[PDB]
Amino acid sequence: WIFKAEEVMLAEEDRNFRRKEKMFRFFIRRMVKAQSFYWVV
Amino acid sequence: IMDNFEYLTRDSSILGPHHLDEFIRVWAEYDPAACGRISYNDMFEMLKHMSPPLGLGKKCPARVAYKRLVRMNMPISNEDMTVHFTSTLMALIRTALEIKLAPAGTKQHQCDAELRKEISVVWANLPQKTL
Amino acid sequence: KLALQKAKEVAEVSPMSAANISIAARQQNSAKARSVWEQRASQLRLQNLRASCEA
Amino acid sequence: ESARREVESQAQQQLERAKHKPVAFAVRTNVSYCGVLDEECPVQGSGVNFEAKDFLHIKEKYSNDWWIGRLVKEGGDIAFIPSPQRLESIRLKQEQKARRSGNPSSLSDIGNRRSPPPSLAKQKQKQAEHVPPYDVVPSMRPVVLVGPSLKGYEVTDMMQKALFDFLKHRFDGRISITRVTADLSLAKRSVLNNPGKRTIIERSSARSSIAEVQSEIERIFELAKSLQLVVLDADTINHPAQLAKTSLAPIIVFVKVSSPKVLQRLIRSRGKSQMKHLTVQMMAYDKLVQCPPESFDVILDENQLEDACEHLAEYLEVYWRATH
């Protein structure tokens, strides 16, 4: 739940460097936990 | 193994399947034959000679035994020349575990009805032993 | 418990959550195998707890 | 008599033509009175049997004694609601059926002290508080989220922002989100006629924070009269009783951790910044937990985000159908 809110308050904080590399991390974490990645591995 | 799991997890302090064997052994020596009914004064010495694991541990619990012989319904209503094993061992096994009559003191009929409905098909052999 | 509480908030209309939790409480009840080991363990737990409480 | 039947028919026709018109305003009650068993209603058989702790919505105009209203219940039809003066009169009627109501007791004392009723025997006295039978509340209930700990901190902010986001997205186009940056717990109605009416008085309360808080009260009312559901992002209220005696009468949503053991480690998951405020962050949890569940309107006592998310969605859908 907390992570969901962190990725919800980060899209509304950029919508209006060291920040651009963090939506990439969020997308990666959303990608390493999906069923597609699990089945592929 | 699972057919005998009740015996294999005994924790032998409230055992009932084995003390009945000792009860039968004690009764056989004092009894030459059934003959219907037996005397009264034998039961006191039988309780004294009964296995301490069930019936009396120390001198004080004997009072509890008296509390099981007195302060409730009496088999003295019929002839005093009557057996008591039908009413003594049953009472002791009822009071040793899952006692319910003492807290109430008046709901004996419900307990008797529960016993009857749980012995529904015994060909009416225990009805004469409940007394 | 949550389904029973569901009906409590909705006091402006007759709630159907009780019926939904009733029809979904007995269908899965037939899965209680309760093997001999589990029954014996429950009885032993009851006896040990009674002995500990009564000392 | 022809007059009663004629007025009955006229009221029925007015009800029929007013079935599809906008709602005017709403009233709040504090007495368990039934509007159907009273014979003074203009039309019999179309009353309201509403208990306390209830909202009524009045649309059209009838007279100084009765109004045309509707219940917040689903399927509740149009009924007739007593006026506040009519409720005062019927409250006086409630305590007159008893043997005595004033000072002269009936303890075997008849014909000795007649004791005509003075001004103390009427409603003129007992004016120390004198709570009106009716209260003015917003048409649509504002939604306030409380818990799981002190607001303005990371954990509570995220656990409420996720739900706020869910409300914005799922109910997009029908819900407006407003944030109350200033305080909101100073909403009083029986303090004075006008404390700090002007900013040039240079009074203690004229230059205080009471002015903007009092002016924020009817903003919620204006949002409610548009039929669009509104929430309150108040960063000061952390307990339902803090905002229960006011005129808002809002829906309070409880997001709570099942046990404080989980909450402590959840606070630990943020970083070293929150360890400084961990102490004060815990008594604000158990103080709010010790509040009776009946104070809150809804409870979110689970851990899953999606299932708790639906728990609010279905409740608000039921509310939406209730007032439509």
Q: In the 3-class helix/strand/coil scheme, how is chain A assigned residue by residue?
A: CHHHHHCCCCCCCCCCCCCHHHHHHHHHHHHCCCHHHHHHC
Asked if C36 and B2 come within 8 Å (Cβ–Cβ), the reply is: yes
- Strands ordered across the beta sheet of D143-146: D175-178, D229-232, D143-146, D251-255, D298-300
DSSP conformation class of B122: S
CA-wise closest residue to B44 among B79, B88, B102: B88
Euclidean distance between the first and the last CA atom of chain C, given in angstroms as a whole number: 35
What is the rounded CA–CA span in Å between residue D221 and residue D187? 13
Q: Tokens 């709901």 map to which residue?
A: B107
Take residue D3 and report the two structure tokens written for it: 């007059």
How far is the C-alpha of C30 from the C-alpha of D158, rounded, in Å?
42
Residue D25 DSSP SS3: strand
B98 touches C: beta carbon within 8 Å: no
Resolution given for this structure, in angstroms:
3.1
Q: Cα angle at D12 between D8 and D13, to 5 degrees?
A: 120
Question: Which position has the token pair 């003129």?
Answer: D124
Closest CA to D77 of D46, D51, D50: D46
Structure determined by: cryo-EM
Is C9:D297 a contact under the CB 8 Å cutoff? yes
Question: D190 with D104: CB under 8 angstroms?
Answer: no
Tokens of D124: 């003129």
For residue D281, how many other CB atoms are within 10 A of its CB? 21
Q: What torsion, rounded to 10 degrees, do the Cα atoms C37, C41, C47, C50 define?
A: -160
Q: Which two tokens stand for residue D125?
A: 């006295």
Strands D66-71 and D55-58: antiparallel
Binding-site residues of B for Ca(2+), in ranges, read: 31, 37, 42
Tokens representing B14?
A: 């409230």
Q: Chain C closest CA to B91's CA: distance in Å?
A: 20
Is the N-terminal amide bond of D148 cis, ω within 30° of 0?
yes
Count of all residues that appear for chain C in the document = 55
Among all chains, which residue has been given the structure tokens 């924020």?
Answer: D216
Using only C-alpha atoms, chain C has a radius of gyration, in whole angstroms, of 19
Cα distances from D88 to residues B46, D62, D65, D129, D156, in angstroms, run 85, 18, 11, 15, 45
- Please give the structure tokens belonging to residue C37: 């080991």
The two three-digit tokens of residue D145, written as one number: 């989220």
Chains touching C by CB (3 or more pairs below 8 Å): B, D
- The Cα–Cα gap between D170 and D315 comes to 13
Q: Is B33 exposed, middle or buried (0-12, 13-18, 19+ CB in 10 A)?
A: exposed
CB D23 within 8 A of CB D57: yes
- Contact residues, D window 174-233, toward A, CB-based 8 Å cutoff: none
- D318 with C13: Cβ contact below 8 A: yes
